[PDB]
């Protein structure tokens, strides 16, 4: 299902207070972090719910009527209006407006705020994959002092942990250290050791929290629950996935030129010869070759496209060397064992994966994704699991499905034949390549079009005078390449290109 | 169609290049011309898109819009163009060199492969290209390259690796994915397989099958593997079946279309000798592995041929 996260914000005095009273306050930096989180959720997955609440203030808004604890927004999809009203209290003067229309001066109750947020999570009508809470404060001793409320809040937090609430706290700016292990580190939802000292740090993860990452992050869904058939009856369930997937601009929305409300449309078929409405059964497809207009219906047209039922038809074993890497049809997919229909599928999958890794032969198979689709020829190469230093799966175990192009998957090609080059020029190119040797990383790039699109949409949402400008990761470092290389380009140009000739059309 | 361009390495190196589509997901250039079911006149058939809420709306009363998460942003295509990031026409530059093993076929974006030469009959460009080819081949480096087809085509990130052939030398371009174009999906450790650890005899039978199901051959004792079932010099039979049906319907405007032909299966069927070899280990593994499984074949009313009343030569009362 979805996920729930609530940002709980202190308001007593420290949020407005700053270490030097000239930089971001623990108040406004929380504003910025929440704005960034809103943007990231809008870009990635709005279906998750986000809530923001203030405690320690002089008023309250919770339905449960607990004083000093003011709720701002419910657990809900990130709305731009939430961001606007949030920025209304952003900056050292935004918190001035906060202190104008609101204030503080009354002690909060962690037990009460935990009660309130537990109710808020109870208000969710959707499957929450996780129940995360975001806390914005820098002190614990306000409740670490009175042991009554302290133990009360500890009990309540234990209850929340029983409920599966993933409580979290943020190292926040304080001129006296974050001050944990005093009233915290014994009450937080924690299962790993990160830091339990009195660290004078002001941030633990505000850095990447403010980091604006713009991507979709589709949840894991089985692209297909296929059934690999070996000969005719030895069939196993297999999960097919697209670990690589082209991202696309969100679909345009039809809406007024006058009020901009969404407009649904409707396309209908009319008898151009009559104006009368045309039935879906009232027309037939055709193709005209020569003097013959071959007329056909639709169902027959799809059936003549169907050759095999959906699934994988094992064509045999072919050595990995017999596969032309320069031959490529369309992006490859991943195949994992699936044991939900055919029991024992994963055991056989392990056996065949090990055997293929040993013998180093891929499984060529006839592929039918779904019905009314001509089967293709696909090579399943045994791709093994790989783990990082953290042992986190960087490569899954299973197979990689690569399309094998047919004869008719190429185009005619007029060209000139092979032309040699001197070994001196080859050595010069080796030196130049080694000069500009850079490490490849799959995530070193983004679509500048998409990035600028996100920035434009954001600026539209926030009604900015101007949008953010997208940095380009695809730019060649022409000045830097020339600086790194030197006159090697001139040397090789004189080596091959005669000084009279300039490469030009 | 030829794509002229210049292989730009920095601001000082330019090589006139000849780009060509080598591999592609080919498709017929004739969509089904749907016509009338009565007079077979596609002209009399026409679509009528209409906008409304009734409360009808016109094409000239609507704009382009988008959904901003839980929000809706009206954003006309004019505004989209003005704030659009725009690339450069036909521009194609290299970004750097990286190890070949840094990239795998898993990152092979696009649905086409571009075999690229230097510009036709530019000897200096050709010699420079071949020198780059040899240098990269010996260094095992591949060139990360930025590509733009034209002014209105979005920029793409891909890599070019040299294809070595005695008759011609090309850089093979395949697009590469952004971090936006990736899926980070975890999968269980099949190596830590306690409940799916196959028996050794099963593994041996599997290996015996693969030996008996291997689709290659040792040629001339030269260890040059000989494939028995290429499928790369074999055309897609879908268009063959299409033409079969088209021809039948043209000759027989009333007869039902013929079924798939047996030679079509044969060109799809791997060598039957491999099948005969595999026959025995197939049954062996079938016995060896326990596998257990956890709507539209709409026929006529009659699974039989005929029925009805008939009582001829019978009037015995």
């Amino acid at each position: 299902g979805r996920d729930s996260l609530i940002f709980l914000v202190d308001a007593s005095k420290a949020m407005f207070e700053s270490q030097s009273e000239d930089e971001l306050t623990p108040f406004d930096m929380s504003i910025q972090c929440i704005q960034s989180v809103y943007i990231s959720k809008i870009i990635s997955s709005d279906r998750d719910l986000l809530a923001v609440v203030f405690y320690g203030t002089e008023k309250d808004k919770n339905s449960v009527n607990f004083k000093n604890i003011y709720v701002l927004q419910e657990l809900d999809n990130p709305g731009a209006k939430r961001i606007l009203e949030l920025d209304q209290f952003k900056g050292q003067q935004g918190q001035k407006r906060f202190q104008d229309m609101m204030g503080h001066g009354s002690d909060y109750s962690l037990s009460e705020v935990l009660w309130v947020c537990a109710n808020l999570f109870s208000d969710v009508q959707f499957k929450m994959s996780h129940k995360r809470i975001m806390l914005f404060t820098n002190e614990d001793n306000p409740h670490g002092n009175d042991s009554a409320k302290a133990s009360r809040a500890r009990t309540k937090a234990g209850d929340l942990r029983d409920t599966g609430i993933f409580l979290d706290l943020m190292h926040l700016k304080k001129p006296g250290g974050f001050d944990i292990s005093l009233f915290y580190r014994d009450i937080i939802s924690i299962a790993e050791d990160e830091d339990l000292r009195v660290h004078f740090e002001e941030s633990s993860k505000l850095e990447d929290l403010l980091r604006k990452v713009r991507a979709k992050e589709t949840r894991k869904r089985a692209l297909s629950r296929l059934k690999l058939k070996l000969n005719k009856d030895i069939v196993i369930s297999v999960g097919i996935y697209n670990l690589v997937q082209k991202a696309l601009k969100p679909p345009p929305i039809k809406l007024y030129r006058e009020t901009n409300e969404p407009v649904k449309t409707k396309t209908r078929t009319f008898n151009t010869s009559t104006g009368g409405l045309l039935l879906p059964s009232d027309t037939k497809r055709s193709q005209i070759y020569g003097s013959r207009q071959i007329i056909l219906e639709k169902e027959e047209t799809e059936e003549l496209k169907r050759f095999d039922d959906p699934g994988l038809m094992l064509m045999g074993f072919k050595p990995l060397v017999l596969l032309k890497k320069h031959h490529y049809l369309r992006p490859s997919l991943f195949v994992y064992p699936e044991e939900s229909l055919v029991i024992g599928s994963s055991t056989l999958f392990s056996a065949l994966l090990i055997k293929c890794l040993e013998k180093e032969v891929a499984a060529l198979c006839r592929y039918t994704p779904r019905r009314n689709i001509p089967p293709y020829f696909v090579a399943l190469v045994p791709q093994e699991e790989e783990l990082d230093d953290q042992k986190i799966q960087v490569t899954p175990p299973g197979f990689q499905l690569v399309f094998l192009p047919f004869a008719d998957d190429k185009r005619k090609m007029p060209f000139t034949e092979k032309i040699m080059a001197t070994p001196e020029q080859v050595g010069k190119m080796k030196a130049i390549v080694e000069k500009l040797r850079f490490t490849y990383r799959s995530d070193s790039f983004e679509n500048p079009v998409l990035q600028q699109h996100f920035r434009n949409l954001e600026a539209l949402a926030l009604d900015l005078m101007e949008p953010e400008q997208a940095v380009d990761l695809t730019l060649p470092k022409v000045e830097a390449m020339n600086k790194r290389l030197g006159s090697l380009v001139d040397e090789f140009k004189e080596l091959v290109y005669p000084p009279d000739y300039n490469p030009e059309g | 169609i030829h794509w002229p361009c210049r292989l730009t390495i920095g601001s000082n190196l330019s090589i006139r290049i000849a780009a060509y589509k080598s591999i592609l997901q080919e498709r017929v250039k004739k969509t089904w011309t749907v016509v009338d079911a009565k007079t077979l006149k596609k002209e009399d058939i026409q679509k009528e898109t209409v906008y409304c809420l009734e409360t009808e709306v016109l094409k000239e009363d609507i704009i382009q819009g988008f959904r901003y998460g839980s929000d809706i942003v009206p954003f006309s295509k004019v505004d989209e163009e003005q704030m659009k990031y725009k690339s450069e026409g036909k521009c194609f530059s290299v970004l750097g060199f990286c190890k070949s093993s840094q990239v795998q076929r898993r990152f092979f974006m696009g649905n086409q492969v571009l075999k690229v030469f230097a510009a036709r009959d530019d000897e200096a460009a050709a010699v420079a290209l071949s020198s780059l080819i040899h240098a990269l081949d010996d260094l095992d480096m591949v060139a990360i390259v930025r590509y733009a087809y034209d002014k209105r085509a979005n920029p793409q990130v891909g890599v070019a690796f040299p294809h070595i052939k005695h008759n011609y030398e090309c850089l093979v371009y395949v697009q590469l994915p952004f971090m936006e174009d990736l899926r980070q999906y975890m999968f269980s450790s099949l190596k830590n397989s306690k409940k799916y650890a196959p028996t050794e005899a099963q593994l041996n039978a599997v290996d015996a099958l693969i030996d008996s199901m291997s689709l290659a051959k040792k040629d001339e004792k030269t260890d040059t593997l000989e494939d028995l079932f290429p499928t790369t010099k074999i055309p897609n039979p879908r268009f063959q079946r299409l033409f079969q049906c088209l021809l039948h319907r043209a000759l027989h405007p009333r007869e039902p279309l013929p079924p798939i032909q047996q030679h079509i299966w044969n060109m799809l069927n791997p060598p039957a000798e491999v099948t005969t070899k595999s026959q025995i280990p197939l049954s062996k593994i079938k016995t060896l592995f326990p596998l257990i499984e956890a709507v539209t074949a709409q026929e006529i009313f009659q699974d039989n041929h005929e029925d009805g009343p008939t009582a001829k030569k019978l009037k015995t009362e």
């Binding site: 990447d208 980091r211 992050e217 986190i392 500009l436 040797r437 990761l473 | 975890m186």
Partner: peptide, 23 residues
């Protein structure tokens, strides 16, 4: 948890967009 995105629980940690830099 190691190798997990803070913003999206259950999603792998998001590395910076980075770029090209020769070595």
């Amino acid at each position: 948890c190691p190798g997990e995105s803070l913003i999206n629980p259950g999603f792998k940690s998001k590395k910076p967009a980075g770029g090209v830099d020769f070595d």
